[PDB]
Structures are given as structure tokens and as C-alpha cells.
Amino acid sequence: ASGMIVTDAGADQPIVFVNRAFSTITGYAPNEVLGRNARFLQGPQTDAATVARLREAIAAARPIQERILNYRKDGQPFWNQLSISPVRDETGNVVAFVGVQTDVTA
Amino acid sequence: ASGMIVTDAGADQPIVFVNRAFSTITGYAPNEVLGRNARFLQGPQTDAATVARLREAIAAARPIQERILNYRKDGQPFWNQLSISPVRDETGNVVAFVGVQTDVT
Numbered sequence: 001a002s003g004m005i006v007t008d009a010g011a012d013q014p015i016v017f018v019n020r021a022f023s024t025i026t027g028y029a030p031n032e033v034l035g036r037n038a039r040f041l042q043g044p045q046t047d048a049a050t051v052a053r054l055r056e057a058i059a060a061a062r063p064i065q066e067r068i069l070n071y072r073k074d075g076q077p078f079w080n081q082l083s084i085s086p087v088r089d090e091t092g093n094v095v096a097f098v099g100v101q102t103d104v105t106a
Numbered sequence: 107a108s109g110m111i112v113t114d115a116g117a118d119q120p121i122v123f124v125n126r127a128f129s130t131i132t133g134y135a136p137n138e139v140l141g142r143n144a145r146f147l148q149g150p151q152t153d154a155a156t157v158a159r160l161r162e163a164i165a166a167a168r169p170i171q172e173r174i175l176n177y178r179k180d181g182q183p184f185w186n187q188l189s190i191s192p193v194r195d196e197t198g199n200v201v202a203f204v205g206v207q208t209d210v211t
């Protein structure tokens with residue numbers, strides 16, 4: 001099952017909601033992640049160029065898909081097939097971002 | 107500011123998250139909507155054909171926009187500029203739905 005993260009649009013995109021599969025994949029409970037930017041999932045082997053592409057896409061409110069190395073709460077690495085999209089109103093204002101995570105390690 | 111509703115994908119699409127503006131627009135607090143289908147926002151003068159279009163789009167996980175008459179918690183009608191989209195993983199599985207409201211009354 002794939003994870004889902006909703007963040008606010010502004011203010012460095014704090015997490016406002018996660019689904020159950022996010023906890024299954026990452027080992028973090030909702031309490032441990034609400035109000036934080038999702039970059040705590042990254043670590044030393046995460047590819048910096050991938051991170052840069054995410055950073056630029058989010059700043060532009062452009063959809064993006066990447067495979068990125070992430071880390072569970074206990075430190076276990078896993079490969080995350082990550083898809084992020086803005087949520088827009090009909091006037092084009094960005095209301096939120098949504099991200100979907102799939103553990104593709106295996 | 108526009109409202110946002112996130113629902114589960116299956117069963118009857120219960121609400122799992124709303125933003126602040128949802129409460130501003132609708133008058134409902136998060137606690138009183140979580141776990142319910144969003145159709146409680148409809149009422150006597152809501153257009154049935156519009157509801158049916160939403161129903162079919164959600165069943166097929168198709169994006170849709172409608173201007174629909176809804177009712178605040180206090181019973182006051184308002185026009186909701188509603189857009190719904192599915193949230194999918196890369197295999198195409200539907201993870202959730204997202205709806206965005208704009209009060210255009």
C-alpha cells in the first residue's frame with residue numbers, strides 16, 4: 001500500500017496529514033511528523049541532485065516524480081518511489097501539496 | 107482561501123482531513139466531519155444531476171469540477187465551486203481523493 005503525505009503550501013511545507021501506509025513504510029507515527037518538513041526522511045546516501053530537483057519543483061509548484069533513498073525512523077534505508085503534486089484551486093492558487101510514497105526496495 | 111477535503115479512496119470515501127478554510131466556508135469543525143462522506147453538505151435544492159455526475163466521476167476515479175449548491179452547518183445555502191481529483195500511485199492505484207472548495211456565492 002502506498003503512503004500519502006499532505007503538506008501546507010507555504011512556510012517550508014509542513015506535514016498536515018499522513019495515511020496509515022506512510023507509517024507502515026517509514027516507521028513514524030503521525031505525531032512524530034506533523035508540523036515538520038518531510039526531509040527528515042533523507043540521510044547521507046540520499047542523492048543530492050534528486051533532492052535539488054524536488055526542491056526546485058516544489059518551489060515552482062510543479063509535479064515531480066523521483067526514486068529517492070529514504071530512511072525509516074530507526075535508520076533503515078529504503079527506496080521511495082515518490083510522486084508530489086500541488087493541489088490547486090480553480091484560480092490556480094496552491095492550496096497544499098500531496099505526496100505518494102511507494103517502497104520499491106525489493 | 108479555498109477549502110480542501112481529503113477522503114479515503116474506498117468504501118464510501120470517508121473524510122480523513124480538512125483544512126482551515128473548509129471550516130470557514132462550511133461552518134463545520136474537523137471533529138464533526140471526519141469519518142463521514144461529504145454529501146452531508148448537500149440539501150434540498152442541490153441539483154441531483156450534478157450529484158450524479160460527481161458520483162460517476164468518483165466511481166471511475168476521474169477528475170471533475172462542478173458548481174454545486176451546498177449548505178453550511180447553520181443551514182445557510184452557498185455555491186461551492188468544487189473540484190475533485192484522485193490521488194494515485196505510479197501503478198495507478200487510487201490512494202485517496204482530494205476536493206477543493208471555493209465559495210463563489
Ligand SMILES: Cc1cc2nc3c(=O)[nH]c(=O)nc-3n(C[C@H](O)[C@H](O)[C@H](O)COP(=O)(O)O)c2cc1C
Pocket residue numbers: 005006007013037038039041042051052054055056058068070080082084097098099100101
Ligand atoms: C507533499 C510532500 C511530500 C514529500 N514527501 C517526501 C518523501 O516521502 N521523501 C523525501 O525524501 N522528501 C519528501 N518531500 C520533499 C522534502 O519535503 C523537501 O521538499 C525536499 O527535500 C527538497 O527540499 P530541501 O532541499 O529544502 O530539503 C516531500 C515534500 C512534499 C511537499
Ligand SMILES: Cc1cc2nc3c(=O)[nH]c(=O)nc-3n(C[C@H](O)[C@H](O)[C@H](O)COP(=O)(O)O)c2cc1C
Pocket residue numbers: 111112113119143144145147148157158160161164174176186188190203204205206207
Ligand atoms: C474528496 C471529495 C470531496 C468532496 N467534497 C464535496 C463537497 O464539498 N460538496 C459536495 O456536495 N460533495 C462533495 N463530495 C461529493 C460527495 O462526497 C459524493 O461523492 C457525491 O454526493 C456523490 O455521491 P452520492 O450520490 O453517493 O452522494 C466530495 C467527494 C470527495 C471524494
